[PDB]
Amino acid sequence: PDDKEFQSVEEEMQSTVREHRDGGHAGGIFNRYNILKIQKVCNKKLWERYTHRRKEVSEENHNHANERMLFHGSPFVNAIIHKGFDERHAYIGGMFGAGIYFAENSSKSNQYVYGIGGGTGCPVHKDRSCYICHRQLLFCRVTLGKSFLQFSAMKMAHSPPGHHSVTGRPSVNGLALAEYVIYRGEQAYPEYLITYQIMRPE
Ligand SMILES: Nc1cccc2c1CC=NC2=O
Ligand SMILES: [Zn+2]
C-alpha cells in the first residue's frame, strides 16, 4: 500500500529527468537519482487551507480544480512542510513575476534545491554537482484552475484577470521545459518530501 504509492512517486521522479541546456551547471550532471526516502507530509491545517481554496477554484473553473502533481525545489523545504507555501516570499524578478514555481520535470526543480541557478551548491562541499550530499525535493498537489498559457516573460504580481495560475509553455527563443506558477500559497500542498542524491553517470 505505502510501498506502491511511493514506487509511483519514485517513478515520476526518475522518468521526468531531462538533459538541461546549461549542461548541468545549476543542478549537476546526472541521468538518474539515488532515492533515499519518500515521506508523506500530513499537515492537517495546510491540507484544509489547500482543499478550501481548491473547492473555491473548482467553483470558478466549471467544477474543475485542474489539479496536478508537480515538483518544487527550494532550500526552504522544511519551512514549507511546516508553514506551507507563501507568496509573500516570492518577488517580481522571476520569468512570470512574483509567483511560486513548479515543474513537471524533477530535474528542473533539482536546479533550485540549493538556490537560484543552484546557488553555490551543497553547504558542505560548495558543489552544485555534489553526489555525496543528500538533497530534498517536494512532490506537490497544485491547483492550477483556469491556467493562463504564456510563452514569453510576463512579470505578474498576481494571476491574470479571470485566471488562477500561469502555465509557461516551451518555445524556440524561450523555455526548454514547462513550468507552472501560482500567486497564492494556499493553491499548493507539499504532499511528498523526497530525500535523494543525483547519481554520477555510468
Ligand atoms: N523558476 C522555476 C521553474 C520551475 C520549477 C521551479 C522554479 C523555481 C524554484 N523551484 C522550482 O521547483
Ligand atoms: Zn556536498
Swiss-Prot record:
Post-translational note: Ubiquitinated at 'Lys-48' and 'Lys-63' by RNF146 when auto-poly-ADP-ribosylated; this leads to degradation. Deubiquitinated by USP25; leading to stabilization.
Protein name: Poly [ADP-ribose] polymerase tankyrase-2
Self-association and partners: Oligomerizes and associates with TNKS. Interacts with the cytoplasmic domain of LNPEP/Otase in SLC2A4/GLUT4-vesicles. Binds to the N-terminus of Grb14 and TRF1 with its ankyrin repeat region. Interacts with HIF1AN. Interacts with RNF146; this interaction leads to ubiquitination and proteasomal degradation. Interacts with NUMA1.
Localisation: Cytoplasm; Golgi apparatus membrane; Nucleus; Chromosome, Telomere
Residues binding Zn(2+), per UniProt: C122, H125, C130, C133
Domain PARP catalytic, residue spans: 1-202
Primary role: Poly-ADP-ribosyltransferase involved in various processes such as Wnt signaling pathway, telomere length and vesicle trafficking. Acts as an activator of the Wnt signaling pathway by mediating poly-ADP-ribosylation of AXIN1 and AXIN2, 2 key components of the beta-catenin destruction complex: poly-ADP-ribosylated target proteins are recognized by RNF146, which mediates their ubiquitination and subsequent degradation. Also mediates poly-ADP-ribosylation of BLZF1 and CASC3, followed by recruitment of RNF146 and subsequent ubiquitination.
Similarity field: Belongs to the ARTD/PARP family.
Tissue: Highly expressed in placenta, skeletal muscle, liver, brain, kidney, heart, thymus, spinal cord, lung, peripheral blood leukocytes, pancreas, lymph nodes, spleen, prostate, testis, ovary, small intestine, colon, mammary gland, breast and breast carcinoma, and in common-type meningioma. Highly expressed in fetal liver, heart and brain.
